[PDB]
Every structure is written in C-alpha cells, then in structure tokens.
Design a protein around this motif. Structure first.
Motif, PDB file in Angstrom:
ATOM      1  N   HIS B  95       0.835  -1.196   0.000  1.00 57.78           N
ATOM      2  CA  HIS B  95       0.000   0.000   0.000  1.00 57.78           C
ATOM      3  C   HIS B  95       0.877   1.256   0.000  1.00 57.78           C
ATOM      4  CE1 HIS B  95      -2.846  -3.081   0.619  1.00 57.78           C
ATOM      5  NE2 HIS B  95      -2.788  -3.123   1.934  1.00 57.78           N
ATOM      6  N   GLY B  96       1.932   1.258  -0.830  1.00 57.12           N
ATOM      7  CA  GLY B  96       2.771   2.429  -1.040  1.00 57.12           C
ATOM      8  C   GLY B  96       3.932   2.532  -0.048  1.00 57.12           C
ATOM      9  N   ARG B  97       3.744   2.047   1.188  1.00 57.52           N
ATOM     10  CA  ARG B  97       4.738   2.167   2.249  1.00 57.52           C
ATOM     11  C   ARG B  97       5.734   1.007   2.172  1.00 57.52           C
ATOM     12  NH1 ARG B  97       1.562   1.689   5.901  1.00 57.52           N
ATOM     13  NH2 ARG B  97       2.023  -0.039   7.316  1.00 57.52           N
ATOM     14  N   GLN B  98       6.935   1.204   2.749  1.00 51.43           N
ATOM     15  CA  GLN B  98       7.892   0.132   3.003  1.00 51.43           C
ATOM     16  C   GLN B  98       7.564  -0.531   4.341  1.00 51.43           C
ATOM     17  OE1 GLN B  98      10.890  -1.205   1.086  1.00 51.43           O
ATOM     18  NE2 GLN B  98       9.284  -0.395  -0.284  1.00 51.43           N
ATOM     19  N   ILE B  99       7.464  -1.871   4.344  1.00 55.01           N
ATOM     20  CA  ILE B  99       7.094  -2.606   5.548  1.00 55.01           C
ATOM     21  C   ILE B  99       7.557  -4.060   5.443  1.00 55.01           C
ATOM     22  CG2 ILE B  99       4.782  -3.000   4.613  1.00 55.01           C
ATOM     23  CD1 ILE B  99       3.749  -3.125   7.521  1.00 55.01           C
ATOM     24  N   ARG B 100       8.151  -4.568   6.526  1.00 46.09           N
ATOM     25  CA  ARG B 100       8.544  -5.959   6.697  1.00 46.09           C
ATOM     26  C   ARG B 100       7.579  -6.612   7.690  1.00 46.09           C
ATOM     27  NH1 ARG B 100      13.332  -7.248   8.783  1.00 46.09           N
ATOM     28  NH2 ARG B 100      13.368  -5.464  10.191  1.00 46.09           N
ATOM     29  N   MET B 101       7.089  -7.823   7.376  1.00 47.21           N
ATOM     30  CA  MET B 101       6.090  -8.515   8.185  1.00 47.21           C
ATOM     31  C   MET B 101       6.456  -9.982   8.363  1.00 47.21           C
ATOM     32  SD  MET B 101       2.446  -7.296   6.705  1.00 47.21           S
ATOM     33  CE  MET B 101       1.664  -7.840   8.229  1.00 47.21           C
ATOM     34  N   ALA B 102       6.120 -10.538   9.539  1.00 42.59           N
ATOM     35  CA  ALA B 102       6.111 -11.978   9.756  1.00 42.59           C
ATOM     36  C   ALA B 102       4.716 -12.404  10.208  1.00 42.59           C
ATOM     37  CB  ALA B 102       7.160 -12.379  10.767  1.00 42.59           C
ATOM     38  N   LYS B 103       4.271 -13.570   9.729  1.00 43.95           N
ATOM     39  CA  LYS B 103       2.948 -14.110  10.007  1.00 43.95           C
ATOM     40  C   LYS B 103       3.150 -15.566  10.414  1.00 43.95           C
ATOM     41  CE  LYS B 103       0.574 -11.019   6.573  1.00 43.95           C
ATOM     42  NZ  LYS B 103      -0.825 -10.842   6.146  1.00 43.95           N
ATOM     43  N   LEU B 104       2.488 -16.008  11.486  1.00 38.98           N
ATOM     44  CA  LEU B 104       2.566 -17.401  11.907  1.00 38.98           C
ATOM     45  C   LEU B 104       1.313 -18.123  11.413  1.00 38.98           C
ATOM     46  CD1 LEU B 104       3.788 -19.740  13.633  1.00 38.98           C
ATOM     47  CD2 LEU B 104       2.508 -18.814  15.552  1.00 38.98           C
ATOM     48  N   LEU B 105       1.494 -19.177  10.599  1.00 38.49           N
ATOM     49  CA  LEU B 105       0.405 -20.005  10.097  1.00 38.49           C
ATOM     50  C   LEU B 105       0.424 -21.365  10.790  1.00 38.49           C
ATOM     51  CD1 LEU B 105       0.662 -19.345   6.257  1.00 38.49           C
ATOM     52  CD2 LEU B 105      -0.474 -17.987   7.998  1.00 38.49           C
ATOM     53  N   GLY B 106      -0.773 -21.920  11.040  1.00 44.77           N
ATOM     54  CA  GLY B 106      -0.946 -23.270  11.565  1.00 44.77           C
ATOM     55  C   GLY B 106      -2.122 -23.992  10.909  1.00 44.77           C
ATOM     56  N   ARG B 107      -2.024 -25.326  10.796  1.00 40.43           N
ATOM     57  CA  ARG B 107      -3.115 -26.132  10.266  1.00 40.43           C
ATOM     58  C   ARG B 107      -4.297 -26.106  11.238  1.00 40.43           C
ATOM     59  NH1 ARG B 107      -2.771 -26.506   4.816  1.00 40.43           N
ATOM     60  NH2 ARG B 107      -0.885 -27.606   4.159  1.00 40.43           N
ATOM     61  N   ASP B 108      -4.010 -25.960  12.538  1.00 34.81           N
ATOM     62  CA  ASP B 108      -5.037 -25.972  13.567  1.00 34.81           C
ATOM     63  C   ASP B 108      -5.207 -24.574  14.155  1.00 34.81           C
ATOM     64  OD1 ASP B 108      -5.403 -28.864  13.333  1.00 34.81           O
ATOM     65  OD2 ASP B 108      -3.548 -29.060  14.520  1.00 34.81           O
ATOM     66  N   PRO B 109      -6.444 -24.211  14.544  1.00 31.34           N
ATOM     67  CA  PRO B 109      -6.693 -22.917  15.163  1.00 31.34           C
ATOM     68  C   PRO B 109      -6.235 -22.809  16.619  1.00 31.34           C
ATOM     69  CG  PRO B 109      -8.741 -24.161  14.997  1.00 31.34           C
ATOM     70  CD  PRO B 109      -7.657 -25.029  14.400  1.00 31.34           C
ATOM     71  N   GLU B 110      -6.160 -23.948  17.337  1.00 29.81           N
ATOM     72  CA  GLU B 110      -5.656 -23.995  18.712  1.00 29.81           C
ATOM     73  C   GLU B 110      -4.293 -23.311  18.807  1.00 29.81           C
ATOM     74  OE1 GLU B 110      -6.882 -26.744  17.145  1.00 29.81           O
ATOM     75  OE2 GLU B 110      -7.275 -28.405  18.523  1.00 29.81           O
ATOM     76  N   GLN B 111      -4.109 -22.285  19.657  1.00 27.77           N
ATOM     77  CA  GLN B 111      -2.783 -21.672  19.799  1.00 27.77           C
ATOM     78  C   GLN B 111      -1.812 -22.727  20.343  1.00 27.77           C
ATOM     79  OE1 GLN B 111      -1.147 -19.155  18.713  1.00 27.77           O
ATOM     80  NE2 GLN B 111      -2.641 -17.527  18.298  1.00 27.77           N
ATOM     81  N   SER B 112      -0.591 -22.793  19.780  1.00 30.18           N
ATOM     82  CA  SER B 112       0.534 -23.602  20.250  1.00 30.18           C
ATOM     83  C   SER B 112       1.594 -22.704  20.892  1.00 30.18           C
ATOM     84  CB  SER B 112       1.175 -24.364  19.092  1.00 30.18           C
ATOM     85  OG  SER B 112       2.477 -24.851  19.418  1.00 30.18           O
ATOM     86  N   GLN B 113       1.880 -22.898  22.191  1.00 23.07           N
ATOM     87  CA  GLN B 113       2.868 -22.092  22.900  1.00 23.07           C
ATOM     88  C   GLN B 113       4.246 -22.243  22.259  1.00 23.07           C
ATOM     89  OE1 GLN B 113       2.418 -19.446  24.721  1.00 23.07           O
ATOM     90  NE2 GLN B 113       0.242 -19.996  24.665  1.00 23.07           N
TER      91      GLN B 113
END
Lengths: 143, 146, 146
Positions: B95-113
C-alpha cells in the motif's frame, strides 16, 4: 454412514424453555462406530467454562432413528431439503425434564437463510414454537 | 506444494505499526496454480466490514521464495520447527509504504505455545521487534447488516 | 426497466487504493427517468460524515452503458450470473483522480458467497486486484454529533 464427520450446530429450538443454552459451540464431530452407532462430540462455552460433551447415538432397526441417554431419549436424523444440512428432532427426558428439541446441522458454518426457514417450518409443524436460537460458532473454546 | 490448502493466521508482527488491526480473520487459503504459483486468500473483519484479500504469489527458481505486487514485494514461505506451522516473512512495498512482516500459520486454530515462542525468536532476530498480535479467529466474516 | 428500484451496495473494489472508503452505506435507489436515464441515490458514512449522493446516469445508444458525473465517468451495468445481483463497472474521474471501480448490487442485504466469488472473477479479469470490501449496511446514516 453419510451423517459421519464434521458438522456445525447452527440452530436449535424446543417445546420448553432451555436455560442450558450455550454461549459458543465448537464443531460437532459424529464418529461412526461398530454396529452403526454414532459418537457425537461437541464443546460448549457455558458460564465461562468450556464443557466437552460426548453422546453415543445407539443405532436401532429403523434407519435414521437412534436412542440416547440410556433410552430416555429418541433422536431422529432427517435430511434438509436444503443442501449440506440435516435436522435432528428428539423426544424424551433430558436433565430430569421432558423436552422435545430440533437442531439444525450444516457441513458449512456460513448461515443459510433457506435452511433456517425450512428448519422453522419443520419445527413449528412438530409444535416447537419457542425461539429459534442461531448459535455462535468457534473452532476452539476459550474460557 | 506442501504449503497448499487451509491455514490459520494465528500471529503477526511487523517493522512499522500496521493500520491493519483486524478484530477477526478467516482462514488463509493458499491455492496451488499452474506453474507452482500460489493464490493467497484471507478475509479480515475491520469495523463492521470484510476486507477480502487476494494476493498471487509468483513462484521463482528458489524454493520457498515468491514475489507479489508486480515484483515490488518478496515473500519467504518457511516451515516452523514446530509441527503443522509455517512462518511467512515479507519485505518491500505494501500500500505504497515500506514494511517488513512476519505471520505465523498453523493447520489448527488452537494456539501452540511452542510455535508462538519460536515465532517470537524468529521475529526478534529479523528486527520485526514490535508487539506480536494474536488474532481472533472466525470461519466467516459478515459485515454489519449483511 | 430491469435495474429499477431498491438495491444494497454489498461489495466494492478498485484499481487504486481508495482512502475515501465508506464505513457504512444506505440502500441505493435507482429511479427510472424520462428517456431511459437512471437517478441513483445513496448515502455513505465516511469518517463521521454523511455523503448524500445523487448521480444521474445518462442513457447512451449502447445497452447497459451510461455516463455520469457530468461525463467524468462511464458506467457499465450488467446482471450478475448470480440471482438477484447486478454489477456496476466504472472508469474515469472520481474526486480529481483516475480510478476504475466495480460495485456488487443485490436485492437482498444477506451475503451471497456465490455472487462475491463471481464478482471477484469479474473484477480480477478487468485488472481490479485490490481488496474486495464488503460494506456494512444501515437504513440510515447519522453524522457524528448530529
């Protein structure tokens, strides 16, 4: 067994007041067992607590007709006219009281107006005239 | 690819502060296309409205390396040490701006510590050192009045 | 005529970032006028302010093709393959800028997933690859502090 697998309990109605109404529900898993029986597992959020329910549905000699709660309840599993939905209708004893209930199941969580209108017609015909509660869904249950 | 199919976007962080502060997100679908490309689809609930996002990830010659936004952004799809999780890391223009991102994906919705602790180490190491947002999950997104 | 009457503006997409993005919308009324023209009336809530819009759509000799905004825009009106939905696609000037937009209209406010998926295919084919915004619906619009 076609009713096997992952279902969403999207709506419920009854002939009596149900104060046991959940706040959110996890998906319902119906596991096919030896002898045509079904194990129903669902988790309900009630009063801040995540309550995990398991009900075995015991196959009878009448297709689509099951017993539960050691014979105190009879459960009828009927297809909806609307695709990817099934209707449970049940009679007998639940938690001491005697109550008739209908539950709308769907393969998808997305609300279906068509399935709900059909569920209304079915239920009111069986003389279930209470509110139709459409249940909040969550894939997991958090206290 | 292994990465194909249904994912839960369970956590995210960035170099800037993103105005994308969702109230819930639907699952992310990575759909395999002709030539090893990926179509990433997710919907975000923001203020009663659903943002339906589709980003085509263009396969390069480097496994796990994709471009998006007419080459203007680079996306790294990297497996987590923790089972059934992946990390997305991206650099460049959004969207015009410079930005670095990390995203955590999982097969399950249950949060894993375990997956989250590892995602924290990953993030701090990459200089995405803002707060890690754990997202509310919904299978659907429906606007107010729809 | 076919398009006449009450519509819900359920989804919108464009080719540029639209910062003027609505937070809520009233129903769109298309009133049939003398000579096949259309009067489109809608109110949009944008940052606490209500935009009460009236757009005269001037019929051309090309079926489904209209001009509006005193010639600054051309509007293509097509039925959706999906029932009870119509698609507007528009090119030209909006708020002193060049921008192409698609808008999904429905007779009912309830989301149709089928209409949305189709609207995506249609839009991405016209090179509108930005987010598809599904709009919150309200019978009324009230400004902040009014």
């Amino acid at each position: 067994v076609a009713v096997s697998g992952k279902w969403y309990l999207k709506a419920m109605t009854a002939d009596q007041e149900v104060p046991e109404k959940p706040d959110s529900v996890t998906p319902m898993i119906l596991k096919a067992q030896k002898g045509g029986n079904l194990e129903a597992k669902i988790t309900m959020l009630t009063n801040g607590q995540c309550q995990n329910i398991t009900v075995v549905l015991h196959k009878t000699s009448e297709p689509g007709k099951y017993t539960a709660y050691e014979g105190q309840r009879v459960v009828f599993i009927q297809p909806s006219p609307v695709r990817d939905h099934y209707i449970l209708y049940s009679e007998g004893e639940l938690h001491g009281r005697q109550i008739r209930m209908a539950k709308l199941l769907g393969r998808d969580p997305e609300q279906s107006q068509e399935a709900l209108e059909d569920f209304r017609e079915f239920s009111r015909a069986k003389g279930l005239n209470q509110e139709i509660l459409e249940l909040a869904q969550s894939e997991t249950c958090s206290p």
